[PDB]
Design a protein around this ligand. Structure first.
Ligand SMILES: Nc1ncnc2c1ncn2[C@@H]1O[C@H](COP(=O)(O)OP(=O)(O)OC[C@H]2O[C@@H](O)[C@H](O)[C@@H]2O)[C@@H](O)[C@H]1O
Length: 165
């Protein structure tokens, strides 16, 4: 019943697409890992990264800064599991390829594979906004790689229906 107050559709045995705010979906599941669509330096912009940071009152950005000081920047396709900040059990910061920077879009395979370590994942379509990848392409990589329970959350009905037609 958590998904009763969201428009949703089962796509595969692993993957369900959901209309809404990924942050609000993750909050319905205590055991969820929320995916952040990040960049290599975890400097969070106006996309879901900014929404996540704002919800955490800046704690996520500060935590990110400390991680990057200690370990250096992530490579495209990499991820790091950090604190949930009461948004989820944990937040998995994933670095999708940036198509505007002519990066290799197939690195989305590595992004989504990283999610399989967790029993329940709530994720946006990585790279499908500021990083300029078509939502259908990001979606196709997700369903190729998914081997755990994934709620893929899109905040646009246009996007939702384009992927459920
Ligand atoms: N709360 C949300 N819930 C669900 N989907 C969302 C949400 N917020 C944004 N989206 C949608 O998730 C998709 C991924 O959006 P982005 O946040 O723009 O992610 P990405 O394309 O990977 O760009 C990453 C870059 O944006 C910066 O915010 C981030 O710091 C990084 O530099 C897009 O379709 C976006 O519209």
């Amino acid at each position: 019943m958590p998904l009763s107050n969201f428009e949703h559709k089962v796509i595969t045995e692993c993957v369900t697409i959901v209309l809404g705010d990924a942050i609000q979906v993750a909050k319905c599941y205590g055991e969820s890992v929320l995916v952040n669509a990040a960049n290599t330096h975890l400097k969070h912009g106006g996309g879901i990264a900014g929404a996540i940071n704002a919800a955490s009152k800046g704690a996520v950005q500060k935590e990110s800064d400390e991680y990057i000081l200690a370990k250096g920047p992530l490579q495209v396709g990499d991820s790091v599991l950090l604190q949930g900040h009461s948004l989820a059990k944990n937040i998995l910061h994933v670095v999708g390829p940036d198509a505007r920077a002519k990066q290799d879009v197939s690195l989305l395979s590595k992004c989504y594979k990283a999610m399989n370590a967790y029993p329940l994942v709530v994720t946006p379509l990585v790279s499908a906004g500021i990083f300029g990848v078509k939502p259908a392409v990001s979606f196709d990589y997700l369903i190729r790689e998914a081997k755990t329970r994934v709620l893929v959350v899109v905040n646009s009905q246009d996007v939702y229906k384009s992927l459920t037609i």
